[PDB]
Amino acid sequence: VVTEAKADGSVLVTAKTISKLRRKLGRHGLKLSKLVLIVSMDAYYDLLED
Amino acid sequence: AVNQSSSVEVSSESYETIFSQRIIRDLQKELVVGALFEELPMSSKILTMLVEPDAGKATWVAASTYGTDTTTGEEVKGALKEIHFSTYKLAAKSFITDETEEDAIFSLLPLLRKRLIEAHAVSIEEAFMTGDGSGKPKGLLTLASEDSAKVVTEAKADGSVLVTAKTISKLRRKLGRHGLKLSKLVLIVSMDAYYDLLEDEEWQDVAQVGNDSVKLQGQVGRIYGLPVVVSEYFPAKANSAEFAVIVYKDNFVMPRQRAVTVERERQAGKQRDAYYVTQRVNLQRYFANGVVSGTYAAS
Amino acid sequence: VVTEAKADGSVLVTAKTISKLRRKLGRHGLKLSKLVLIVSMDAYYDLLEDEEWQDVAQVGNDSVKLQGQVGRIYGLPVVVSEYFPAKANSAEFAVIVYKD
Amino acid sequence: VEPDAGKATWVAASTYGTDTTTGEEVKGALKEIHFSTYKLAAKSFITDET
DSSP states (O other): OOOSOSSSTTSOOOTTHHHHHTTTSSSSTTTOOOOOOOOOTTGGGTTTOO | OOOSSOOSSOOOOSOOSOOOOOOOOOOOOOOOSTTSSOEEEOSSSEEEEEEOOOOOOOOOOOSSOOSSOOOOOOOOSSOOEEEEEEOOOEEEEEEEOGGGTTTTTSOHHHHHHHHHHHHHHHHHHHHHHSOOSSSSOOOGGGGGGSSSOOOSOSSOTTSSOOOOTHHHHHHHHHHOOSOOSOOOOEEEEEHHHHHHTTTOOSSSOSSTTTOOSOOTTTSOSBOSSSBOEEESOSOSSSSSOSEEEEOOSSOOOEEESOOOEEEEEOSSSSSOEEEEEEEOBOOOOSSSOSEEEEOOOOO | OOOSSOTTSSOOOOTHHHHHHHHHSOSSOOSSSOOEEEEEHHHHHHTTSOOSTTOSSSSSSSSOOSSSSOSOBTTBOEEEEOOOOOSSSOOOEEEEOOOO | OOOOOOOOEEOOSSOOSSOOOOOOOOTTOOOOOOOOOOOOOOOOOOOTTO
16 A cells, blocks of 8 residues: 655654555455554554654 | 475375365355345235325415305325336256266265355345346346435545545435434445545544544444444446445335245256256335435546 | 525534524523424434534534434424425524413 | 355246246356475584584
């Protein structure tokens, strides 16, 4: 999916990204309201300014 | 098989590995129109009944003409409009031959019956949503095409789309007539339109400035008090219907003269066992009202 | 009152019509509620995409969710009526009384 | 793996000559899948002198 953030700096990653991102996968998807989410170690410390 | 790489001992050829006879299953649609609408049993081929029209006004006196002195108007001299329910029929068949089960694995017999009923189930479900008029009945998405139910426009056809809560309010403003008091309306939304609805930023947003606690446990399918039904049977993104809303109170009944019967013939055939299945169930409305589809045209 | 809006054509009904109608009604005409508000079928629909204080979310309601809007509009009950003619220069509300 | 849909059709209304009107359906044509497996190994050593 393109685009949200552009190399951090002045545009950071906020929780709305995972709404548009899952437009083709799960919840509902195949029939199952479960998924597992993996995030980067540094990106985890970006998700604090939202 | 044992090749790629076979080095240096036993090379052999290919098929040299155990195979597994187990099956698995991917996606499915969840069946929401084929089991939601009241069955009407009937013993004929067409069913008929009469129904009244409305007003029926009575004129007031001209504030001088009180006596006799006739002139008082009168109400509706012809009345009792008939309504006819037609019934439509379909069939399927599948025929197997001995020559394609002897060199096989002896397992194809029960799977075929499961598949033909699912194919029948897919076919009736699409026909109830989308259908034309000739041979097969007209479907729900184009039910709202003949009464002028439609609107232009809602969202923006893939240039900054959003499906915000004021859409459904405008859609009910466009339907209007005659029962605003929530008579258990049924609403069905597209796969993509259901996903787009969680970007919002409207009414049930990401903060407690908008919604009361209703998600529980995190972005669940709850709209304006009502739950929301989703379906994958909508056509791919274009100028068509993404949301359909129907009233359910007297109407959307399905007449039927039998249930599903599935049988087999092979005498006086040659070889083959041949499965047959037949149906007679269709969709109609008593009154031409209470139906809307968005549409979602262009912007 | 003439005029709040413009017959759908770029701005719809707003919850501060009822305050202005109550203000001009009959001066000494109050005493809590005990006043009847008849609302057009049209006018009931555009006050339901609010964006005002008497909402179906949480902005300033009595926790309505359940059902699809409630009779709380300045303490008045809402009475629907569908008998209203052309939408141009017409009346869409009636504020009336029943204590005398 | 078992295959995807699966479509039936509706009569020409009048027809009753048998004449099944069914099109025909795709009896038992399906598709196979297969699993292929890779090997991961390491070797490391040490000398008597240390």
